[PDB]
Amino acid sequence: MLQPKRTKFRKMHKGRNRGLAQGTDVSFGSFGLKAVGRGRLTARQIEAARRAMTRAVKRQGKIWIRVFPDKPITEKPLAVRMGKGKGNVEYWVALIQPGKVLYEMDGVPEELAREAFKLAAAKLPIKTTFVTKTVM
């Protein structure tokens, strides 16, 4: 789930998170969920959160997800002594920072959008907070 089909390179720097990036402003809808901390995000967590919102809002409104994994990351399949090059990629990963808006909604009531994002936030590794369109 959630990775590209062609890649120029797959062996990559793990790197660190700067705590800034693009974000803060809601622009696909009227309500959203913001990261409000540092951590690590996977495709299984995004799908578990997608599967959560579809129980609250069902078929109502449209749902936008501006987030997708940042890098391929290498892993080896069993517990092992390191050496003889990097392993292989079975999943991609992203580092998230406090200003990132993760999910956006519009065609739904505010007290339902907040309740659906509370249900989706239970699938995520960090405390998250509700955000509005802020008229601009």
Next chain:
Amino acid sequence: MFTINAEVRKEQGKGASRRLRAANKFPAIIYGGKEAPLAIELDHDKVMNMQAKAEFYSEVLTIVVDGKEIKVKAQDVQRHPYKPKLQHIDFVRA
């Protein structure tokens, strides 16, 4: 949006920006309308509660500077990445 007051600023950048944003003032600018850009400081009282309503961006605003009152419109709004805080704001002349 009924008339608001502002004051001219001369000290600027990073440390002066953070020392202005001390839970009391904000930086702002007025530009365009065939006149030069003006740098101003704004008290936190009204402007934050005004930008809660969409009419703040679709209807003109009257601002007092050096005791004299002029017409402007809101154009851009810079926000803080990890707290609900206002960093800087733009106004265009009318």
Next chain:
Amino acid sequence: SRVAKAPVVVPAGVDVKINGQVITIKGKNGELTRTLNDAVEVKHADNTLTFGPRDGYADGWAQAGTARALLNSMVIGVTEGFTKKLQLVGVGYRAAVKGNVINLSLGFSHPVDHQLPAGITAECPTQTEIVLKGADKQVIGQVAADLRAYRRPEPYKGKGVRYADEVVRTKEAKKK
């Protein structure tokens, strides 16, 4: 902290005598109570009371807001006291009073046979009704709470010691 403002009100049947911290109150319930205003100060106006804070004691109106309730409970305690609400359920079950010793039969090996605290009387007008008599609102509720605790109410049988209350803790059976 609003309740220290209250007038409290007293019936004509109390004379309300006071000297420093000591308040002396009596009435037709056979009691002569001497109660203390030690951490707070009270002033009487023949029919109404006012409380306030003392020098070297807790500031504000909070510890005064408690002192009104205890004095009202003793003005009631010396005049007429407090009414019945404790009950028993079960056939052959029996409450009985043997002077300062009480008995409660619940189909078990021994009928409790417990001895009363100081300043309290027990009465049984019928073998399934329990009345506690005195002037202290606390002891007549504490001894009922120590008595209800013997074996405790049974879920489907409903049997044991209960209070007069519209809530039902007796459970109904289910189909298997």
Next chain:
Amino acid sequence: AKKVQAYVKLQVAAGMANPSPPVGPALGQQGVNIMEFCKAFNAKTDSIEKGLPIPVVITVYADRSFTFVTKTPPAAVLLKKAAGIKSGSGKPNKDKVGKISRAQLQEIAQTKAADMTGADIEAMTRSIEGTARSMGLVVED
């Protein structure tokens, strides 16, 4: 209607006179037979609608003796002959048949005048317009 409190509703259909789940669970214990009920309104159905058995409200007294709160054509059955609707309209102002004229609404109101208590022809409208609002049918021009 009048005095409708604690009462069950049932359709006078012979197809519904054998399956017990569509029936209130005490009505048979309360002494009623469902086929005797269907028979007791068959000529009262035939004389106001063809093919559709009426929904009726039932009441019971001593010696299992039952009586009805219904004897007039229902507002929902009159409306299906008055507007281009098949069986209802659901959402307001989505279909071109989803409207009725106030003049025809106050006309069919008098077809139910034997179940009107308001003693006024405007109070007949106030007692049928709610079924149009419930059906998603537009009553404003």
Next chain:
Amino acid sequence: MKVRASVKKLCRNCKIVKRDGVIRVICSAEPKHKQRQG
């Protein structure tokens, strides 16, 4: 009974009460929902 680790305010007959340092659930309509800690 149970404790689990968190409490919900799921009905109107439930108010949830903190007594002698601990929070608990009581429901006069349904003893099935008694819970300790929160």
Next chain:
RNA sequence: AGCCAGGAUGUUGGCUUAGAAGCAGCCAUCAUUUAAAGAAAGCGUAAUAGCUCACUGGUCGAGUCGGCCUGCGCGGAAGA
């Protein structure tokens, strides 16, 4: 806040069905009367009734509440 008193009318709402009286599928989130009253939250249950409610009023009487900002805490919290 508590204490006290109410919680209508169109209406048996409309449709769909296996199924019914918020409360086993679906639709509007209607209008008049009124100081006030939903096709809704949790119970009741085989159900209904009804409560615990939304929603208003009396009584009393001057502050009161959710969220949010910013300082500081508690319980959550087991091992040889």
